[PDB]
Each structure stands twice: as C-alpha cells, then as structure tokens.
From a paper:
Accordingly, we generated the E275K substitution and the resulting trimer, BG505 SOSIP.v4.1 GT1.1, referred to as GT1.1, was expressed successfully in mammalian cells. Thus, GT1.1 priming followed by boosting with BG505 SOSIP or ConM SOSIP selected for at least two different CD4bs-specificities, both of which have the ability to accommodate the N276 glycan and neutralize diverse HIV-1 strains.
We also solved crystal structures of fully glycosylated BG505 SOSIP with 21N13, and of unliganded 21N13 Fab. Overall, the crystal structure of 21N13 in complex with BG505 SOSIP was in agreement with the cryo-EM structure in complex with GT1.1 and we did not observe substantive changes in Ab orientation or epitope when comparing the two structures or the bound versus unliganded 21N13.
Author numbering:
A (entry chain L): 1 to 213
B (entry chain B): 1 to 100, 100A, 100B, 100C, 100D, 100E, 100F, 100G, ...
The structure:
Amino acid sequence: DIQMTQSPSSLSASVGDRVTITCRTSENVNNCLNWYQQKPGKAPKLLIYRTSTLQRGVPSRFSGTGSGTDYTLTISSLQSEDFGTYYCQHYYGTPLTFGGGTMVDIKRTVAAPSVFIFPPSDEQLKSGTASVVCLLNNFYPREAKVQWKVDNALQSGNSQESVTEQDSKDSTYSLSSTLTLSKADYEKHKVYACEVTHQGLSSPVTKSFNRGE
Amino acid sequence: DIQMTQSPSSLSASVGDRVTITCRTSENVNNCLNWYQQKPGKAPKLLIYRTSTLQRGVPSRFSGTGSGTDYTLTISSLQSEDFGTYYCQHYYGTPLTFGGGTMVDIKRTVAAPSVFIFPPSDEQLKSGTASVVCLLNNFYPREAKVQWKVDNALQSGNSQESVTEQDSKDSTYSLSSTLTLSKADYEKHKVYACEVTHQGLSSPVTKSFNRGE
C-alpha cells in the first residue's frame, strides 16, 4: 500500500532537451521500481526495471537512477517518438502500485485549429443513420473543446471524439468529432453547428450548415 | 459411459390413449433413473425420480416402473397439454447420461400449411433494415421445410424460424420464417420467395412478390 507521486504531472520540451521525471514513494521500495511508456490506445511498454536496467530494445538515451524513496527517469536527448505518458511502478510487496503518470510531448508555438464540418452523405442517409463530422486540424496544445448545436440547442451524449498522436513533423494534433443521429431525428432539424474553443483562438469558432441547403 | 436408448423416438396419440415409453440402458442402472418433460424453448421439468416416485404437482396419469436395464414411463390417459419431449436420465455413478428423448404430441389428420409472404413495411425500410416474413399457418405434422430464394438464389444463414406450441383446439402448428437483410442488399434484388415442403402438399408451394410491385 505504498503511495507513489510523480513530478511533474505534465511536461513539454524540445527535441534534444534533457528530461528528468521524479518518482517518490511513501516508503522505501529497495530499488524495486520500474518505468513504463504508454502511447494512446496502447498498453504500457516497459522501459526500465530494477531502477536502472534497460529493457531489451530500449534506446540508451533512457536511464534510471535512485534509491530508497527517490527515483529518477532521465531522457538525455528528447526525440519526437518519446511522447506519451510515463509511469513508475514498485513491486516491493503487494499491492503493486503505479504512479499517477507524467505526460510528455514536443513543445512548439500555439497553433489554432482549422475547423471543418461535414454533412452526412446521401449514401448514409439511405441506411437510416446520419453522422455529422467536425474536424479540428493541426492544432497545439492538445487541450481542445468541441460542442455540437442542433438548431442552437446544445447536444450531449450523442457524439464521440478521436485524436491523432502528435505529428512527427509539425508537432500538432488533429481531432474529429462525430455527431450520430437517426435519420428521423436528423430530418426534423435544420441548422447543424460545431463550436470549437482552443487557447489559440481569440474567440470560439463555429462551423455550421443548413440541412438541404 | 452408460448408454441409454429411448423408444420410440417420436410418438403421436389421441387424447385418452395409453402411452408407453421405454428407456433401455446398456448396463445395470440400479433404479437410479429419472424422467423429465421438456416443453419447446423451456428447461426440462422433473416428472419422476428414483424410477417410480412422482414429483409434487405431477398428475397421477404419469407413472414410472422398471429395474435393471429396462424402465418405462406410462401416460394412462394422454392429455393435450402432455406434448413435449420426454427424457430419461440415470445417476448410477458418473458420467450422468440422458436418453435421446421421445417427442410426444396429439395425433390428427395431416393439414397442409397455409403460406403467406409479407414484404418489409415502408416504416422499416426508412430505418435501414428489411425483414421479409413467411408464415406457415395451421399445419400438421410438425415436420416442415422453408427455403428462401432471392432472385432464384438459395439463401443461407440470414433467416430465423419460430414455432408456436401445438394448439389445444385443432392440434396444429404455426411457423414464421424471417429473412433479415440490409436495405442496400434488399434494394438490389427483385423477386423474393419462400418455398415450403410439407407432407400435406402434393408439391412444394412457393409464395413470392416483386419488390416495388
């Protein structure tokens, strides 16, 4: 029942920077500490075990040090493919415990999202369902909010979002929001709008279309 | 390990007839034999246990006898609600084994099925799915075969069937066969037919319709 605190909780640096992540345990874990890198949608990948031993196939720029209640993961030269959430984990007794995680990505200047809205196609409308797609293209940082409005009414519970991983070239993100309705519900409304808020925008951006126009 | 043979496999008698079902075992079962009644779509119901003892709530017209390898289930006066499949089961050691089962229903003259076909409704076609229904109404005996032909092509794996229990009045059965397609697959074909084979029909009967007519 050993508590584990990671610092920082979020981190952003440039390619080639030196990155240090600290893992503090409430009690001495006697070097029984492991480090993992998790990319979105994937299982955590083991980087370091037993404080300092690199796993097979892990690049040498990852190193681990520490003892007692103080442990450190170090990336000597940060690379583009090093984004994700890093976890420490102790195995000194039970229960096995993970740290809260530390999110890492490549730092760049703020880029506002470019917003596009797509009406459902006639082919899908024949199928009895209607999907309205809203695209937020090439923005940074990751934090973004998308709201759907059908005839100026805020929607809830009928949309899903998907985000791409941080691009290796421009270090931006892309996001798609899909509003799913039945054809009957889609046909009894006129205006379909997508409102986007992002710190790169001085004010929310709305893209809308009128059904059948 | 211990094999069990029931005789007969299928049985049809009139109301008030005396029905005798034989359960033969390959080895001595030592009177550790039970009898079950199973209605269609339901779990087996224990009728008699330990060769001869009736379960509470079982009418006295059911009786079980036998010893060694020969056992008998007797219905002194068959009633209409006695339809179903009857199983014997031994528990003299393991593995526990059941008999093959004996189907019982009320005897009557052969009745040919009245076949109807129903196209999918407009309300369902708007929803994006198409269900075509073929009805076999008031037939006897139970054995019947239904085949779906879409543009004269035999269909497989896209239909389900449901049967009513034997009617208390006329002792007939009714069956529905539902062919489920997507709206797209349904719209790319013209002729939809169900072909029915039954002993009451001198030749197979085909009911069909042309989509959009």
